[PDB]
Curated annotation (Swiss-Prot):
Entry's disease: Noonan syndrome 9: A form of Noonan syndrome, a disease characterized by short stature, facial dysmorphic features such as hypertelorism, a downward eyeslant and low-set posteriorly rotated ears, and a high incidence of congenital heart defects and hypertrophic cardiomyopathy. Other features can include a short neck with webbing or redundancy of skin, deafness, motor delay, variable intellectual deficits, multiple skeletal defects, cryptorchidism, and bleeding diathesis.
Name of the featured protein: Son of sevenless homolog 2
Domain of life: Eukaryota
Organism (species): Homo sapiens (Human)
Domain Ras-GEF span(s) in chain numbering: 196-432
Residues of the full protein shown: 562 to 1040 of 1332
């Protein structure tokens, strides 16, 4: 017992297979990649702890391994086979005496178990939503945590329990609310031209910033919002995207369904006015929601409507469109030259991740998971974390909140069925020239006069 530490057989303990190029690859050393087994070994290594790798793994692991499979691998890493007891030691349990038995425990078993526990602590602290999404997983973790060899692990078991109870039991002056033709507590009259344009923006900025905060880096790693069971692994992500879609299609609907020309012009200005308030609140998601709406096929062709806008109002719009063009060049410099609160544009993060994930392949195929890929994506998701911090100093307005949350411009029709309708409706309200205009009469009777953006 003064030479080589005797590890178990790799026939009965996979993790102890020899470090080779065909199962583990580097850049305490940085993990470039490995087999899932060898990642779990380094994640819970005997020689040293590795907080950096702990954090990154737990963000990124769902891109190469199911939560249930992770828990099973950790449990497997925990249940380490040890040397033949001996009758002397078998009595001694009723701590053992054998030199080799004592050494295998203190040097290999004791630390490996301690590190597995710290991973559980980190898992339930930061990524508890795994256990919320699957209660059978939560039962497994607990039914394994309660059955741990009680002496030096007791504080660690109780700290994970303490966290799990805390997580379970979870389930600077502001300005005045602006009102227009619609008056509070009366949802009946609620519409784009009846509510005050500043408060539409404020409420959309509040809704969109809240939807922003709830997106976890987990949902973005692995491109997992574009896969077969995307619903479970990217629920907040999807809400954000669906909102954007639904609101973009609403702004369109509002414009093109105003058949009367004068109304449509007032409706387009009101949207450009809402776009300004987004700019001032630094809600670029809403600036771009509006931009997309006006840059849609049904809207963009309405040349006579755009021509009846004011010089200044066309210019604002064109500077918002300026942000988007040349692969979002002005936008990216406009971002990180600003003090929050702020909601950045989400689509550009999704693209810049998606090109990283096509440009790097997940296996390493050397005649093997690319964890370095995942680390670089984790760093890219760290940019998102920056603006889910300083929230907005605006008062939520419950009824408006719900008006915007329960928008459904598409109806029981599909997206491509609805946008088809928009295009034909667009041609119906502004035909191709030379053709005389339709003098379509007004549908509503509310005042078109804008209250105009100053609080």
């Amino acid at each position: 017992a003064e030479q080589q530490l005797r590890l178990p057989s790799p026939e009965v303990y996979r993790f102890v297979v020899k470090d080779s190029e065909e199962n583990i690859v580097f850049e305490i050393p940085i993990i470039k990649g490995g087999t899932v087994v060898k990642l779990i070994e380094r994640l819970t290594y005997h020689m040293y702890a590795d907080p950096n790798f702990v954090r990154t793994f737990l963000t990124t692991y769902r891109s190469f391994c199911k939560p249930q499979e992770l828990l099973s691998l950790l449990i497997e890493r925990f249940e380490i086979p040890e040397p033949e007891p001996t009758d002397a030691d078998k009595l001694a349990i009723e701590q053992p005496i054998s030199a080799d038995l004592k050494r295998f425990r203190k040097e290999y078993v004791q630390p490996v178990q301690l590190r597995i526990l710290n991973v559980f602590r980190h898992w339930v602290e930061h990524h508890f939503y795994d256990f919320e999404r699957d209660l059978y997983l939560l039962e497994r973790l607990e039914s394994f945590i309660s059955s741990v060899r009680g002496k030096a692990m007791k504080k660690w078991v109780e700290s994970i329990a303490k966290i799990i109870r805390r997580k379970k039991q979870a389930q600077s002056p502001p300005p005045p609310i602006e009102w227009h033709i619609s008056k509070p507590g009366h949802i009946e009259t609620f519409d784009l031209m009846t509510l005050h344009p500043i408060e539409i923006a404020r409420q959309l900025t509040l809704l969109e910033s809240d939807l922003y905060r709830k997106v976890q880096p987990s949902e973005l790693v692995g491109s997992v919002w574009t896969k077969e069971d995307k619903e479970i692994n990217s629920p907040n992500l999807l809400k954000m995207i669906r909102h954007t879609t639904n609101l973009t299609l609403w702004f369109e609907k509002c414009i093109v369904e105003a058949e009367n020309f004068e109304e449509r012009v007032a409706v387009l200005s009101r949207i450009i006015e809402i776009l300004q308030v987004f700019q001032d609140l630094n809600n670029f998601n809403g600036v771009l929601e509006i931009v997309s709406a006006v840059n849609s096929v049904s809207v963009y062709r309405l040349d006579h409507t755009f021509e009846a806008l004011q010089e200044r109002k066309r210019k604002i719009l064109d500077e918002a469109v300026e942000l988007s063009q040349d692969h979002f060049k002005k936008y990216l410099v406009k971002l990180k030259s600003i003090n929050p609160p702020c909601v950045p544009f989400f689509g550009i993060y999704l693209t810049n991740i998606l090109k990283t994930e096509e440009g790097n392949n997940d296996f390493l195929t050397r005649h093997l998971i690319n964890f370095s890929k995942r680390r670089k994506v984790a760093e890219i998701t760290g940019e998102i974390q920056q603006y889910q911090n300083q929230p907005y100093c605006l008062r939520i307005e419950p009824d408006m909140r719900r008006f915007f949350e329960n928008l459904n411009p598409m109806g029981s029709a599909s997206e491509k069925e609805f946008t088809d309708y928009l295009f034909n409706k667009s041609l119906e309200i502004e035909p191709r020239n030379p053709k005389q205009p339709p003098r379509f009469p007004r549908k509503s009777t509310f005042s078109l006069k804008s209250p105009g953006i100053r609080p």
